[PDB]
Design a protein around this ligand. Structure first.
Ligand code: 58H
Ligand code: 58H
Ligand code: 58H
Lengths: 142, 143, 143, 142, 143, 142
């Protein structure tokens, strides 16, 4: 079966390819902003929203990957094939957990309809020719 | 943060830990079951429940992990080291995903309440020493 | 003064002496169960029941015994001369705690009367010669 | 599993520590108190209150500590011992079982509220410069 | 600007100055008292009063000062000079904080009115020469 | 006890770590802007708000620190350990009294809800990757 992480939220993996893969801030910055003012709500015993739910399942699925990145560093004796794994997890796999972490946190902050309009408005700027492309990128705010 | 992926659904991971590793069925059976009787809803653009939502995020997160073991096979060289990683994903985290994949799917066909009532009732079964322990474990009916 | 901790709950110590001392699960399994099902109620500012109160004062009694049971190692220079310290109280005395932790937890999950009828029922089961009756045993559950 | 045995009784462990440790009477005193005014009430088969319940469990928990302080001593002879053993029991948790055995015994004979009103009413009286305070202590009435 | 931290609460610092230095109890007792019977409200996200708000800003500002005397101990070298700073914080500003810490805490357990009525009534006591002065100072009751 | 200066105002010390420590204008600029159009209200005999109250207690607690910075300069004979103190007070301790002074004055100027939204909107810009990070930072205004 072909599940899309963003389908139920009115988005799609298509629409998020609009954003360049070198947008989405670091996983550090994301998780930090999560525990900023959602720390309480995330540890709450009640699913505040479908957004909150996915954010929890994403944060933990990432946590499983940091437990993997540690066990690999302390059980793989060959450091040529040990640092080939601890790189892929913190780089390539981290990208999917950056899009997901951005999307859900941005929604809890600004609103899912505001986010979906941002994804579209960005796809006008990013696809606007460099000559007329305005100096400032569109940024989510209030 | 300290996030229990079961706190939402009236459960805890401590309650889910009592289950022995030989309890949950294979990840292949866990995904064959999911697609067999929830696919239409899982691929749907409707947040059918908090249960469904978390199931998707789990099925996907695991699909991420099988992309890792596919990459490790054809990018990691040392055959004794690439089968140390491939055996960790396939086993140690696999149980964590078998615990979660089972839970959300179970509560979909029996309800969160009937499931939690089981976990408790099973908890007191396995906690009973084998001598006084009833011959067969309690089994989950729709009741 | 002879205070029976089970008296106010419709039972006696003479009764829980019936379930053969190796029937009650391990203290950790007990405590985990208390965390899994009653943690929130145990940290509440409301005396949820006479059961909750006694169990709070019991987990903390053993919380005064871990700490003291289970003690000597960070303060006793002498590692040995404890053949039946040791332990021992964690065997011939730290069994009272397992009885209480079971009784109160079981009653909070199944009901005071349900447990008092199970105390009796299972009591007559094990008291049979290991003979004809039966294969299965009485067990607290949700049938 | 952070359990405060005073929380259900509208108090905290911090508030009991607010009183000086030379305040709560000896355990031999406290145990003689219950058997004096409540012996019938405690050996009673109905939980007269949450206090009666907690106090019964406390007296037995202490009885298990004078059973341990006796069995450490009744094969040994190396130091005392009764050295770093039957002193610690009768020093550190001894204070705790003086604090607890008092609190509950008091509320039965005074009133849950009057007890808490007093714990504060004392506690700070002793924390008051002598030149400007009542001659002797403030003392529980009702 | 000229801000009197007492002008808000119907008082003045001149009225608060009449109190001799031996009057307010120690800063350690002033913080032990605060946490003993206001902590739940002090840590609360509710501006319980203007009194509470100012108390927090004072308890914190003092916690800042004990971070200064902790830093001065292990960063200032000259032992005769680092004990000149440590003695200033612990004494001269400490009295200012004992004046303020006492005031807001006092008005919390007796009301702003009963407190201000005292400060006046005490003001006329201490202002009386010892010969004609009543033997014991007036003491603050809940009245 | 663990008091948070910002908890009651709907904020938290977490949320203010969003802002880089080299934001918050000088203490001079802060106190000057305070006496600009709040001079009257701050010296008023009535607590205009909980914000006004904390601002008063913060300005004075700072004033105590400038009395300390002076007494140190004229009673510490050793100028190696005298200028080690008058630096820490005007630098490290001054930072906490800059966040506090900014936060409360900004609220009295723009509104506590507007400020809390600024702290969030800033935490999007500051955490937005330098490549797409728009030339102008979000600034509080009207
Ligand atoms: C009447 C009757 C039966 O007794 C029969 C036959 C019932 C027993 C429960 N069964 C279903 C079941 C699970 C589930 O929901 O299935 C969709 C789930 C499950 C969930 C997902 C999977 F992939 C596989 C399973 Cl195994 N779990 C369990 C389970 C696990 C351990 C012990 C007993 N039952 N079973 C079938 C009906
Ligand atoms: C719930 C229920 C029930 O009460 C119901 C319905 C069951 C409960 C368990 N019972 C076992 C049983 C006896 C008894 O309920 O002992 C507690 C009694 C018994 C009675 C007195 C004793 F001292 C010991 C026993 Cl062993 N007798 C036997 C027995 C007789 C013949 C062969 C083997 N076992 N078994 C059967 C009934
Ligand atoms: C009846 C009667 C009593 O007379 C008795 C006993 C009352 C006298 C006031 N007492 C309390 C008190 C202060 C306060 O509010 O306590 C929380 C406050 C106080 C406030 C904060 C502290 F940390 C310590 C104190 Cl000390 N101040 C004072 C104080 C200061 C000087 C002279 C007399 N009383 N006392 C107790 C009741």
């Amino acid at each position: 079966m072909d599940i899309d992480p963003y389908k139920e939220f009115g988005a799609t993996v298509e629409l998020l390819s609009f954003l360049p893969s070198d947008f989405f801030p670091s996983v550090r910055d994301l998780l930090d902003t999560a525990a900023a003012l959602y720390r309480d709500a995330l540890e709450s015993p009640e699913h505040a929203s479908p957004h909150h739910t996915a954010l929890r399942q994403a944060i933990l699925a990432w946590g499983d990957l940091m437990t993997l990145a540690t066990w690999v560093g302390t059980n793989l004796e060959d450091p040529a094939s040990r640092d080939l794994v601890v790189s892929y997890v913190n780089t390539n796999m981290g990208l999917k957990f950056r899009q997901l972490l951005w999307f859900h946190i941005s929604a809890l902050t600004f609103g899912r309809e505001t986010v979906l309009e941002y994804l579209v408005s960005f796809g006008v700027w990013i696809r606007t020719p460099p000559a007329y492309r305005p100096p400032n990128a569109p940024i989510l705010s209030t």
